[PDB]
């Protein structure tokens, strides 16, 4: 079975973007690491609010709980 | 397998840490010509309050020791 954890491990070291439940914020950056509780670390992050670039944040941590989904870009 | 422990309890006060090296040399000469040997010696203090001791201790000391800190102190 291909589990979310192996898919995500393969997604590490790749450009991703993560849409939070709020959808008020999306984050596009390289996926540095993710833990067993699925908190997210991204680098070079860029914030897309309402589909527009808000700014370039850089090395960023995302609380697992806020994550709606993650997609590869 | 020895138990690790803390030995550094010193927080250099801002007023002391602001002192330049020339200032520190001068302070040592003025304090009965204090001479040091060894690497990394912290700067001398000139007041009991630059040592971060509780008020109890402060009251107690003064009480315990009357007048200015000695050069050795």
């Amino acid at each position: 079975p291909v589990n979310p954890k192996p898919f995500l491990k393969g997604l590490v070291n790749h450009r991703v973007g993560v849409k939070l439940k709020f959808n008020s914020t999306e984050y596009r950056g390289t996926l540095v690491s993710t833990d067993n509780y699925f908190n997210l670390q991204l680098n070079e992050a860029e914030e897309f609010v309402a589909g527009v670039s808000h700014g370039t944040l850089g090395e960023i941590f995302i609380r697992c709980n806020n994550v709606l989904y993650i997609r590869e870009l | 397998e020895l138990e690790p422990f803390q030995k550094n309890f010193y927080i250099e006060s801002e007023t002391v840490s602001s002192m330049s090296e020339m200032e520190v040399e001068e302070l040592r000469l003025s304090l009965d010509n204090i001479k040091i040997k060894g690497t990394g010696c912290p700067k001398p203090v000139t007041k009991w309050s630059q040592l971060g001791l509780s008020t109890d201790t402060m009251v107690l000391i003064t009480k315990l020791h009357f007048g200015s800190l000695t050069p050795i102190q």
């Binding site: - | 309890f9 801002e14 309050s49 630059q50 040592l51 971060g52 001791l53 509780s54 008020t55 109890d56």
Partner: protein, 237 residues
Amino acid sequence: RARDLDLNEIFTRDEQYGEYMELEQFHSLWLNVIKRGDCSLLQFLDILELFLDDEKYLLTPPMDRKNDRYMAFLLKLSKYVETFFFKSYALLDAAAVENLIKSDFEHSYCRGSLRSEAKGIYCPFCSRWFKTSSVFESHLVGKIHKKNESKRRNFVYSEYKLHRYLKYLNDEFSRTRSFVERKLAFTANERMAEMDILTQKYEAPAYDSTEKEGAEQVDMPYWLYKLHGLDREYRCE
């Protein structure tokens, strides 16, 4: 006569009945009036020190003295310092002090009390200097100074009070700053025990059941005794 008199309803625990004055709160508010966090408790106290000087708080202001947030803050703080002052020295005639300060304010402060050999005479209300006393006087009737003295009067006066009351409390200011540095240089256990002490001092009877009334002052053969046979106590029946 005063059986329901309670100091704890006048002094907070951090003030220790006049030992210290609690300025952390004002660091929160005052510090925020700057819209940043570059300001530490100690740097804030460093700011307050300006008001011990007769000219610094006027010519080297933390913020622009025409800023709203700033003037409001200064008001609140001033009020605090004054109430603290009279709170910690009940025995002195409050009205006397008040009137003294007010008269000093009217007769000197607003009359070109601040003078420089170079720039001349400074005005608290317009924040400008003046060549000679002549132009200074004919400026105190101008529409500008009328406007300002008519709008920023309360603030100027409050600033002044903060000044003189902080001067009268120099010993308490220093005492507290010291306290700050101490607590700051504590560890966890230390800070905790100290807090315990302040607390106990706060919630303790003003008179202990264990106080004094009328205690006025004026103005070898070590091995030999074992050898002797006292290793085993002997007895005659």
